[model samples]
Target chain A: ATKAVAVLKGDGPVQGIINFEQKESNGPVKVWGSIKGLTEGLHGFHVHEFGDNTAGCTSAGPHFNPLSRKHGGPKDEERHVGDLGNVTADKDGVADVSIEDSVISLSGDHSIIGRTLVVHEKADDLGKGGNEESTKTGNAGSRLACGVIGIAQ
Target chain B: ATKAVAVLKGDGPVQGIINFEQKESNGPVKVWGSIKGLTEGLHGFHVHEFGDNTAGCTSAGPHFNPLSRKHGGPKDEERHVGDLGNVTADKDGVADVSIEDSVISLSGDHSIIGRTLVVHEKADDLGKGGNEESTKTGNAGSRLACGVIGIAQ
Candidate 1:
């Protein structure tokens, strides 16, 4: 798979991005990156559609759930294709997160190569136990921060 | 439409929740809240899904995009439903933000009754223009802080 990375900085304080690929791979695309200036705890993270870095990352679009399925857990078979799970930060507000998913792609129309990485202020309930909204990916809360996954040098 | 409010306070350095409600209203729901312990600047803000505060606000699920759309400008009809827009922090890191959305709901299955509020380290692009990704939301990066939206007393 082709590897790429991008850095999201400036504007204020918090910053980070995803180093990803868009090449054809058998398993999930190898994804790696770090988040800093966080609150030193667990945060909801996911892949969103669109890569527009303007508008303060709002242009990245919504979660890349092209299937239009109900908001399910990250591991749910019926969950959005863009789901990448959650990440935790340290006491210093730093998150050294790493994981791989088969459903995620680096290439193709569904590829998240040019997508965005969003950090939420809450945790995803995994759509298992919670309120009725819990069935929809635990109804994690809001868009705390965002960054676009760009091509690495 | 039922009205509710959420509040958070702590540390005195950086604390406060984005207070709002999610019920079925004839018109758009009114969202309002206050922030404390923040540095004076523009902070990216939005409504997230879940109500779980376990992550201290990092687990609020993904942006409230029930349609599974891409992350576009808050005013962009093509964007996710979770994009409640942005908030600017005063010089003291304190901000009072408010906005109205016709599409969001406070009740029913699509209700946002229990969601999350997040603060970013930068300002949103507001859909000006930039990289394919940046153009969407100005590429606001990192979760500098966060809070949850809950029922107010």
Candidate 2:
């Protein structure tokens, strides 16, 4: 089965549309999306646990790491399931991020297909570039924007 | 009538706790809470739209603003309902913040009783610190950490 997802573009100070599709790879699930209307710089992005879009964007919960690992880079052998790495915006603050996850599935108990997407204000250091015992994932800094993930239409 | 809420303290690199209470006020229903564990400085705090606790805090959605106003200080008249203002952390990166909202009720519509708490790395200007929009809430910068706002126990 195949699914298509699209984020409704908004006209606010920062807005954009993101598309997510299941990739051809069979290892884990692959997600790719594009963002627009940013201020032109590096932005942090990640996957969250809950689907309730109540707190506007703040209620989505923490990263999707059910395993309870440390926050590390997206490529780390062991890290939080929510660690997807950073999405760097160009001088115009626009970025396109694509990633794959072996632990996060689209179905069954480990599926994160109905989770949420969060954008941050700074760049993620992937843990290696910053403080000691830094989070497994990059210290992406503050959350600037966010959206929810659902069944692709 | 009074309702019992659950409160969770902070763990991990960024220290803090989740505290909230469901109570009735004169205008609208409001869930009040405060977050501790911050560096000695000013931090940005707000009630996001989601409830997930993933991403170590990024899962929380954007500020809870049903009214969709411009980004201003929590105390500004033209700011989003999600803008609760900034919290000043002591020299040890610890802060105590208390907030109430009319749009966010405790028991009914627009209830933020169970949501998320987001702390930023910068201080909010309350509109007087930013550019021409000094009248707007100060531009609180960088999301430092986040936590889920649960029932106050």
Candidate 3:
């Protein structure tokens, strides 16, 4: 099948386009994009539970965790499907991100279409932050930017 | 009846939410939103022709000119429906915009839903820049940011 893409924007100067490509059914999804205008350093990036934006990014709900698993890195077996981990940014505030995950899909029950892709202000602790919030949200900060994952052309 | 909102995002630190409200069918739309992370000046704001983003904002095409009229300000009689004119950004690069117009609406044949809202890198000259580009694009430069207008709940 073809790939997917999500164009993220926020209420400030944070915007970018992220693309997702999976080779086969439920296979590792190759994700790459240039998310510009972020703070210098790492930022938590994940797929959120909803596309709803009625009350800003706050209304989008928690990370997309249908399996009810705790938050972990993209490579962790016990991690939520949405847990893609941290994306590093340059001093100029641009995150050139690329990752391949065994989970996350474009079709079937785990499909990400119509869901929200979110960027955070802080780096995801990847379930090792040693706190209650760490296990749930990886202690990622504010929702910096987000967009709906739509089908490709 | 109720108001509509569009969330705009870009590839940098430019992101914000814009709101549109119309009291009746074909009635004037009351547009307002706080678009942050601008360049501390005026930026052209308008509705584009399409919501397609297969190739960035370029796929959005020209301004929404369903009337086939020349590009003009939001209040001009001979204006494209998309011409909302320039929005002034404060020193902090935040555009707190509020405008009311009889030509724009949230419903009817001229409905703006499913269209794209765009912010330009330059000020809109209101078709008076004394050049061909001015009349067609108000001399607005590159597309700074944009978002798809969707229905409200």
Candidate 4:
């Protein structure tokens, strides 16, 4: 139903544009981007509840859990709406990736617009990290950078 | 339910951002904007029917007239949903204005998300341009830019 864009910016090496586009009517939306400034490994990626990146990444708030589901990988099928697993950064610390997701939307109940996106410093263990924080945050470590998902031209 | 955003674009001197905020519950929604790239006078500002600006401003379709009301000014009780009038631009081509509109909204039936915002080359005569085209388009002249209004962060 909609096409959107998010300008990612933060204190660390995570800065880029996250573009969201739907393929067809009531179809899955694709979230993709070429992000720079990372540690050449997997990092947590998610849609947070608040879009207010007022005070950098932390201000973006927690993962968006409208369904109150547990933290899990993007393929768990029972994962939180925010869970999108990890974006692997390359040798140049750039994570250029593209994938279609059913949970992230631009309109209706699952819409992620007006929300914040987080790029965590560590990989999200999905709910298998076996820790209290793992179930809640996937132990995604600290937020590297924060970006408010905004509408694009 | 309260936050929204519009990004203006095209091949004209009127382009920038328009942010939407609902003042209170079921109350007037504050439609404010700080747009640049325009002449130093009035320019027609409105929410159009479609969000496709790929072919430029004209691709946005007609004004948003969901209720089928006759063309009128923003001050008039009867008007189209897209009947937002002039947005003044300074010598620097910047229009910084704030107005709480009772007709526009951020949610419910009047929600403006997923719509298009148009910047006309001329001032919208408030549907009183004194002609047939005036009644239909306020004689707002050629559209300088077209931008989709999407949910904001």
Give the TM-scores of the predictions, in the order they appear. 0.46, 0.45, 0.55, 0.64
Interface RMSD of each: 15.2, 10.5, 4.7, 6.1
Task: Please say which candidate is ahead in lDDT: 1 or 4.
Answer: 4
lDDT tens digits by residue: candidate 4, A1-153: 467666666775578767788876468888888889889999999988765533567756778888998899999987888888999999999999787888777776777765777888899998898888998999989998755554444
Question: Each candidate: RMSD to true structure?
Answer: 14.0, 14.4, 8.5, 5.6
- DockQ, in order, for the candidates? 0.02, 0.02, 0.06, 0.13
Q: For candidate 2, lDDT tens digit of each residue in B24-87?
A: 5435433434445566777666766654443435555566666776667755678766576777
Interface RMSD (Å) of candidate 1: 15.2
Best by DockQ: 4
Give the per-residue lDDT of model 4 (tens digit) for B1-153: 677666666775566767788867588878877888888899898888755543566656788888999788888988998888998988888889687788877666556665677888888899877789888899888888765565444
Question: A32 in model 1: Cα distance from truth in Å?
Answer: 1.4
| Decreasing lDDT order of the candidates | 3, 4, 1, 2
**Quality class of the docking in candidate 3, CAPRI style:** incorrect
Q: Which stretches of candidate 2 lie over 4 Å from their true place?
A: A4-12, A23-26, A129-133, B1-153
Cα lDDT tens digits, model 1, A1-153, are 165444444354666765664446655576777888877777767776654444454555666777887555566787777776678889998898677677777555465554556777677666665577765545667666764443232
2 versus 3: better DockQ goes to: 3
Residue B22, model 3: lDDT of: 80
Alpha-carbon DockQ of candidate 2:
0.02
What tens digits encode model 1's per-residue C-alpha lDDT throughout B93-116?
A: 788877777766655444554455
